[PDB]
Paper text:
As we have shown that the binary complex of AhlB and AhlC is partially haemolytic, the structure of the soluble form of AhlC was determined to 2.8 Å resolution in space group P6522 using Se-Methionine SAD, and refined to higher resolution (2.35 Å) using native data. A stretch of 16 residues (L155-V171) at the end of α3 and the start of α4 in the head domain are hydrophobic, clearly indicating a possible method of membrane attachment. Within the tetrameric assembly of soluble AhlC residues L156, L158, L160 and L163 in the α3–α4 hydrophobic head of subunit P pack against the hydrophobic residues L246 and L249 in the tails of both subunit Q and the symmetry related subunit P’, to form leucine zippers in the head to tail arrangement of the tetramer. Y154 of subunit P also forms π-stacking interactions with F250 in P’, and K152 of subunit P forms an ionic interaction with E257 of chain Q. The head of subunit P’ adopts the equivalent interactions in the tetramer. The other two hydrophobic heads from subunits Q and Q’ are more exposed on the tetramer surface and in the crystal pack against neighbouring hydrophobic heads from symmetry related tetramers. Thus, AhlC appears to use assembly of the quaternary structure to hide its hydrophobic head from the cytosol, rather than the conformational change mechanism seen in AhlB. Alignment of AhlC with YaxA or XaxA in their respective pores show that AhlC is closely related to both these structures, but that the extended conformation of AhlC subunit Q is more similar to YaxA or XaxA than that of AhlC subunit P, where the head is buried within the tetramer (rmsd 2.8 and 2.7 Å; and 4.0 and 2.8 Å, for subunits Q and P against YaxA and XaxA, respectively, Fig. 5c).
We show that the orthologue identified in A. hydrophila (AhlABC) is a haemolytic tripartite α-PFT, requiring all three components for maximal lysis, and we present the structures of the soluble forms of monomeric AhlB and tetrameric AhlC and the decameric pore form of AhlB. AhlC provides the initial single leaflet insertion, assembly with AhlB then producing an oligomeric hydrophobic pore, and finally recruitment of AhlA produces a hydrophilic fully active AhlABC pore. Structural and sequence analysis suggests this method of pore assembly may well occur throughout the tripartite α-PFT family.
Author numbering:
A (entry chain P), D (entry chain P): 3 to 230, 242 to 267
B (entry chain Q), C (entry chain Q): 2 to 155, 162 to 238, 243 to 270
The structure:
Amino acid sequence: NGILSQSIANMQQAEATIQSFSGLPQNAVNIQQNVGEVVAALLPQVQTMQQQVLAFAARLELQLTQQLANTGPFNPEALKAFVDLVQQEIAPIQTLTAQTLTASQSANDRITQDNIALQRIGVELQATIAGLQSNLDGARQELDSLNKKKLYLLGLGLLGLPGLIALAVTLTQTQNKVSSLEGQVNQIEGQIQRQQGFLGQTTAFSQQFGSLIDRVSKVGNTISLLGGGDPELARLFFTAALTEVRTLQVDASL
Amino acid sequence: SNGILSQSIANMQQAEATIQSFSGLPQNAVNIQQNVGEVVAALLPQVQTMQQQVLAFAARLELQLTQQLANTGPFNPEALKAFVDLVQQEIAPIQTLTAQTLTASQSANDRITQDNIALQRIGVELQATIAGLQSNLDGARQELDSLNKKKLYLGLPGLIALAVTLTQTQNKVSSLEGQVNQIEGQIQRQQGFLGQTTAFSQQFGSLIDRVSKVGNTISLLGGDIANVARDDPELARLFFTAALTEVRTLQVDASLEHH
Amino acid sequence: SNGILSQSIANMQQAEATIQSFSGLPQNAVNIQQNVGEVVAALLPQVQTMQQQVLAFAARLELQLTQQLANTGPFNPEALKAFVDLVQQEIAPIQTLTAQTLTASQSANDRITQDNIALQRIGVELQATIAGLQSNLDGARQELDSLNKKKLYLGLPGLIALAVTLTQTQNKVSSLEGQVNQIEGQIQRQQGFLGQTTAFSQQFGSLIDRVSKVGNTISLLGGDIANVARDDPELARLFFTAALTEVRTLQVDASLEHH
Amino acid sequence: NGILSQSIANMQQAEATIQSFSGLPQNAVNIQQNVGEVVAALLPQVQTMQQQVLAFAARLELQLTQQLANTGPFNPEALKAFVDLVQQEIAPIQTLTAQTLTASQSANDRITQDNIALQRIGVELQATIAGLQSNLDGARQELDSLNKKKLYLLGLGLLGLPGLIALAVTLTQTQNKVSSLEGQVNQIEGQIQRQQGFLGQTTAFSQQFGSLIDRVSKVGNTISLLGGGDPELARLFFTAALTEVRTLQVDASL
């Protein structure tokens, strides 16, 4: 039903949470910029398109029902002079629609490409962790060993003082190795975390944008049909065009 | 170069701005937004303060202990007793500030967990609801079919009347389509918002764990110092050597920049 | 090369073997396992059968219609009437078998959804429970601290008795640690099992949608044929040309191998 | 508490669901093989280790309490002749433990590496979809346009017959283009789906295996300590060793 309106609203919310991230790679920054432009420029034009499409279709719908009801002389002078009006009225709305479609598809494609790039970076950060975690795990088992050595020696009174002094050097060096490795592993885990949340949002935005483009393409196709004898010619024609305006009010409904 | 405390703080600062970005959510979500707002605005400066105060205390005691150890003569058990009293007095405010910071963090993170669960419960009920509608629609498309089968079956006063039913039913199919997409929208927002809240808590749990390890270290250190007061007064060498390890443990664990 | 029906069937066959691999789960999970077992064992061969029967019927009507269209003379409205009666008779069993297959699929997939929700509800309650224990442990480690602070405070008949408390409390810390890890284990199993069930349903939803589109096409086709019976008997050319498009729509939609 | 037992059980379940997958890339097959070997060979040895560690520690725990209780002449002849027993008893258990540790770490590392490779393939399948989906989307909008053209023409009676025949060629070609593109996109989506579920399982197995290795390293360290005068020497020593056997019964508890 109100799929345009719902898609728009959901796109606005996703955009707001997309702008809220900082310190991300360039591929993310590209999406933040493009998404900015989509919401400030394309979504207003979709709203505009919607109104104009509904206004146009309601007015032609009346006029087609009027023409089905008329009587008097079949007047080929009237049909071509009517049709020409409809092709003229329709022309700029067909343009607005196609333009919207092309620019929307163009923008979505770039988000798709930047998302794939962003996932590539994601898996490569995962690979950097594997190497360092390995080191860390080892440093941590050594540290556990030293911390237990320490409590042992403390139990031995003064006999454990020589052990304890020698031990204290090593503990210091292993605590600093652990500190530095855990520090680096945590920084990278942070990046992955921020990025995965960021891609959640841009995937949600892209899916919504995809529903909007599908509706826009559908509206565009119906318009192409409208935009493109004997008495019971016109009946069948006007009857056929009426069907198309009616699906237009459904397809572009508020 | 930023250490664990400092990365957690900074990660919690970024995640909060993202949590504030979500609108139109249930009360349980708003509870997390304000809670997170107060953590960042008030609790994290406290942690910064505690961290500076722990490092300052560690640097002083480090120095004092090494000068105790550079002593070659025997140890006067009265100066010993007095130094131990001084240290226990300097330990005390720092022990208790760290305990306050740990409690305030646990309580606020415990409320994020609770509100998080309450939100998951809501989310499940949103899926129970989509299922129902989905069936009302599975089933309104059956009504739409047979109402076309029974027309593709077939005077003119049965289709003046059938038309008015048919439209009313497409208006039900569409309406239901709308409703499912609405609810899906809300589910997607909630799942996004819950991913961020979970992330904030993972960061906050790293911070809690670091603050707790610091508390523990102070306690071990307290234990080393006390084992001088009680007490062959050359036992002092051993408990000072051990205390000095705890003091340096502090410096590593609480440092503003890792190694 | 495998088409949509055939990929869905094969994906549903692999996912079922993986769903059967999980043990020690709640009743709601066992309900999905048996349901999925019966889908694969019984409903998917039905779909295979329907698919073969639709293609066979499509190939025959394709031929019959093209030979109607290769006719250059006018059309005898009695042969027309009889051919339409023949086709409506051959349409009928194929329409209804497709409707049966669609219903049996909806009902069984609807029960996977319901059991899925019931399982998510359980999972939420498992998180409410970890939270509680986590607090009982947050809080038993406080008891463990002060019971060490009050010992690092301190004759011998207070520590013969304190020892017996302390151990009893470590036995509570450990026990709780055990309990949290237990429950986490179960959560992880459920989340794994729910990922597979969701995957099975996504596949099953692709199949439902394809079967439904086929049903719809038959219906459009029925509509084209009927519009000959009713009825300038050269209108036959138009409705035969249209029927022939639906017939080929079938062949593409139901084909064992895509294009 | 029972972290060994719980880790083992959870590893057995993950392994069973890991073997249940088929038609996966080589990187998955490697994990299926290694995980097979871990559960049939390493996990039994961990169970064995556990028993022997608990049996050893209970017996030394008794003997240390007995020695703390004894009276009579300080007998250096007895301590070194006691200790030597303990170092001899302990020796093979220290070996079993270290061996277990080394082989476990070795196996986990390979799962980690195969997981990273598997994610790489995952993102590259995602990239293949983007290109084809683009084509598909376009074919589908064309098809929608043709399906609406068809209903239009059918409404025009025989005037729409010429249109309808020409249209039917194009519909056929566009349905076959859609069929083929949707077919290929669905196959790849299937692969990603199976793989993501497969990586869920191997990530769960790897995390459990990581908890087991940490416990095993802890048990190993405590053993190293045990494995490595005046009267109130022995008191302090035996008192120190008792502390270590006690944490061994805790660390390796059933």
